[PDB]
Design a protein around this ligand. Sequence first.
Ligand SMILES: OC[C@H]1O[C@@H](O[C@@H]2[C@@H](O)[C@H](O)O[C@H](CO)[C@H]2O)[C@H](O)[C@@H](O)[C@@H]1O
Ligand SMILES: OC[C@H]1O[C@@H](O[C@@H]2[C@@H](O)[C@H](O)O[C@H](CO)[C@H]2O)[C@H](O)[C@@H](O)[C@@H]1O
Ligand SMILES: OC[C@H]1O[C@@H](O[C@@H]2[C@@H](O)[C@H](O)O[C@H](CO)[C@H]2O)[C@H](O)[C@@H](O)[C@@H]1O
Ligand SMILES: OC[C@H]1O[C@@H](O[C@@H]2[C@@H](O)[C@H](O)O[C@H](CO)[C@H]2O)[C@H](O)[C@@H](O)[C@@H]1O
Lengths: 141, 139
Amino acid sequence: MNGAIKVGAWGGNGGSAFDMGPAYRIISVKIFSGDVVDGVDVTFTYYGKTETRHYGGSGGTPHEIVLQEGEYLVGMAGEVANYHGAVVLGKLGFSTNKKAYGPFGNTGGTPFSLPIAAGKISGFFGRGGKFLDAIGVYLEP
Amino acid sequence: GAIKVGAWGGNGGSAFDMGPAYRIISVKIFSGDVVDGVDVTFTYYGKTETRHYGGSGGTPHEIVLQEGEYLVGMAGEVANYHGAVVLGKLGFSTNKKAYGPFGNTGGTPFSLPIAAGKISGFFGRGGKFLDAIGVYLEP
Ligand SMILES: OC[C@H]1O[C@@H](O[C@@H]2[C@@H](O)[C@H](O)O[C@H](CO)[C@H]2O)[C@H](O)[C@@H](O)[C@@H]1O
Ligand SMILES: OC[C@H]1O[C@@H](O[C@@H]2[C@@H](O)[C@H](O)O[C@H](CO)[C@H]2O)[C@H](O)[C@@H](O)[C@@H]1O
Ligand SMILES: OC[C@H]1O[C@@H](O[C@@H]2[C@@H](O)[C@H](O)O[C@H](CO)[C@H]2O)[C@H](O)[C@@H](O)[C@@H]1O
Ligand SMILES: OC[C@H]1O[C@@H](O[C@@H]2[C@@H](O)[C@H](O)O[C@H](CO)[C@H]2O)[C@H](O)[C@@H](O)[C@@H]1O
């Protein structure tokens, strides 16, 4: 969009597109996983107000990443697997400039990794359905 | 304020940093069993330069960016070639067409599709072969 850097769209073509848009500050990310990744719940602040978005499906169990002050999402990885005739993320994980999280999910598949040597993730986008078909990120310094 | 993503590959070789370019002009990928090295020709503040990363083997595969065409994707596979963790397959995609991957040695795959932005530089490690590679991204 306006100087945005949207890298990704890892996963399958099913589901329906979702776009969080870049955030001003990602407060917390919650990954709901089961055999695969069900959805991602994101709480962030945009133009002053605190917002929460619900992506992917409603199933799965929550694993939350809370960004302490000065901590950012500097990496993302996982596996795009086939789950009952549907290409979705079977494993997903993130890394912060402080600790590493996950991966969350138990279905193996073709891997992908996005180690950020310089920059951070600032937002999310992708395709959702009964599960998390695909996920991508917004990058910024 | 540079967005450097990745660096897929091993830890062998020596680090190289092409830095960001005003405009890439072309990229040559020398490959054999793996990825021997990459060649990058680009403009940089009025000047036109050429950088080469990796060994001196392999056969060249050239991608010549056309008028208003950029690199919007990179993918390949890091591998363990007779002991050294190097890239075994490598390819790029332009907003007009996809290339390769070039190389015949598999390993753990990786891909970097770019929905918004482009590649404007490279960095990583190299030696007799292209040990690892990363890119600079821009709006
Ligand atoms: O569907 C609602 C229930 O979903 C449960 O998670 C599921 C896992 O048990 C199963 O293995 O995988 C699927 C998809 O990955 C998950 O939906 C939750 O544990 C329940 O709390 C929830 O009610
Ligand atoms: O697979 C192609 C079709 O996928 C459909 O989405 C699926 C959902 O119905 C289902 O609940 O979840 C899976 C993954 O979570 C989705 O693939 C789309 O609705 C169709 O338009 C599409 O053709
Ligand atoms: O493997 C550890 C050492 O790797 C060296 O680089 C390798 C080159 O010597 C060799 O010719 O090629 C491979 C792949 O192209 C390189 O990994 C480093 O120069 C050493 O510093 C390092 O200890
Ligand atoms: O080293 C000089 C020669 O290198 C050749 O490429 C090599 C391949 O033949 C071999 O199979 O794999 C290695 C590693 O990828 C390559 O270096 C070129 O094809 C020759 O033209 C060149 O003389």
